[PDB]
């Protein structure tokens, strides 16, 4: 679980979406398994605008943050799960590191700041959502 929380906004994974999030949409995009709802408070997290290569992770099946190299945002076949089928994620990124379905939501960020959040992974393989192009994020 997690969220990034920048402005009037919350962007959580959208398979994980609550209906409170659902019933204060603002965007949402299943090929990315993103989904954006409206906040009354304000949020603390900024996001990064780069192109950054290099970051960490929080990993909630390990209470630890890990620092890795991720590739840049792509069309990846992803996998068939027994919870899930076969599909193109879009504008995801990829790293070796821990992950388990749980721990989808945890932030990668850079220098800059928040970069995406966790959405798939496996044998040692970790994807990130990731959020930099999103320049709405900052405003309205
Ligand atoms: C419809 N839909 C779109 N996206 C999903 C979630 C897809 N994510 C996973 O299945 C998953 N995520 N992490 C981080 C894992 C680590 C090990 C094994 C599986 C996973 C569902
Ligand atoms: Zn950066």
Redesign the pocket.
């Known amino acids: 679980s997690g969220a990034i929380y920048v402005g009037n906004y919350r962007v959580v ?3 994980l979406a609550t209906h409170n999030d659902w019933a204060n949409l603002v965007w949402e995009d299943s090929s990315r ?1 993103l989904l954006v709802s409206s906040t009354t408070a304000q949020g603390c997290d900024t996001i990064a605008r780069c192109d950054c290569q290099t970051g960490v992770y929080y990993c909630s099946s390990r209470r630890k943050h890990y620092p890795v190299s991720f590739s840049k945002p792509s069309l990846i076949f992803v ?1 068939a ?1 027994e ?2 089928p076969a599909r193109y994620q879009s504008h995801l990124m990829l790293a070796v590191g821990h ?3 749980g ?2 939501g945890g932030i990668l960020r850079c220098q800059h700041g928040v970069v995406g959040i ?5 044998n040692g393989l ?1 994807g990130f959502a990731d959020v930099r192009d999103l320049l709405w994020l900052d405003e309205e």
């Open positions: 994974n959208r398979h398994d996998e799960s919870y899930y992950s388990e379905p721990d989808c966790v959405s798939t992974g496996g970790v």
